[PDB]
Amino acid sequence: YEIRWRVIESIPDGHEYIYVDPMQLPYDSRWEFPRDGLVLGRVLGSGAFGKVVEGTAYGLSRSQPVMKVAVKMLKPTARSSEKQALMSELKIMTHLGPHLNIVNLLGACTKSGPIYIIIEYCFYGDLVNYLHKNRDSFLLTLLDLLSFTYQVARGMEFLASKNCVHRDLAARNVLLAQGKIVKICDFGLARDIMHDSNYVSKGSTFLPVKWMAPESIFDNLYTTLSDVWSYGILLWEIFSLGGTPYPGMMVDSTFYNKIKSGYRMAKPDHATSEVYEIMVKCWNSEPEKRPSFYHLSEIVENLLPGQYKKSYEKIHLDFLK
Ligand SMILES: Cn1cc(-c2cc3c(N4CCN(c5ncc([C@@](C)(N)c6ccc(F)cc6)cn5)CC4)ncnn3c2)cn1
């Protein structure tokens, strides 16, 4: 190809070194959970082709013989396109490993019918409804907002270390667990970073434009660095207490023109000067200049009381006992 500026730089030293593709890896049978040990209850989120329901699981844990869970599944209206994606989503989760700030996978029903993905249940729901619920009380506290901001930073650091690009980081995809523990969810659009080069076929039809970095919209480039842009948008959501990004702006020619020119959202009412600067660094137009998720945690860690780090580590270690 003759136009070299349109070729993205591609990174393998010798034939001995291969990319471990999680899509190609075997399914550990220990994830399997009999379908007749799962009762399905109320819907937790739904869409045209799928839903997440609350479930009770009997005998999934030795600690909790009757345990509340969530269950990701497809509707009858879903086609084979949605069926292959849910499978690949299960593949990404079985190989990620567990983390304190991820809605962890507990099991799956893969053997007979449609796929069920069984995930831990988060008592408080998503961060957008939670922040709407508490708006009047705030005016929750400010430290809570910082704590949410740190935990997502650690969650994302864990994902990027596994070379996993989330591609839909947003407040609607942050849940709150029993001890005000923040959990990232929805790996439907998640891809390994080497996925787009090795098995090239994509075409998600509807995208979260207002959360996406310029090079993701315009060039279909998804990296950890475009996740960091989304993390900036997530921060704006949290400190506007559940606000809609770019409020009053339709996504159109002029919107894309504005973002490309350097337009950015103004500071939200409940963000400090220092916290707005984090969102600004996150929306740098040159992706390589955005801060890393490790660096972001270190910045946000400074904004929290000194003991928080020690207590957060105590929760974290305990979770993996
Ligand atoms: C009021 N309240 C609510 C909760 C709550 C809510 C969750 C939860 N979520 C629910 C939202 N999610 C979600 N919704 C839709 C999709 C789809 C439509 N795109 C989809 C579904 C299936 C499919 F195969 C493909 C696509 C995906 N995911 C998951 C996270 N998970 C755990 N606990 N929990 C607890 C608690 N109080």
Side-chain angles (χ1 to χ4, degrees), residues 42 44-47 50-52 70 72-74 86 103 119-126 175 185-186:
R42 57 137 155 191
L44 284 287
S46 48
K51 59 176 174 174
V52 169
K72 205 195 200 96
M73 47 181 285
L74 295 178
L86 184 61
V103 308
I119 59 192
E120 68 189 300
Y121 176 86
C122 305
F123 181 70
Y124 296 114
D126 64 39
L175 311 192
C185 73
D186 217 347

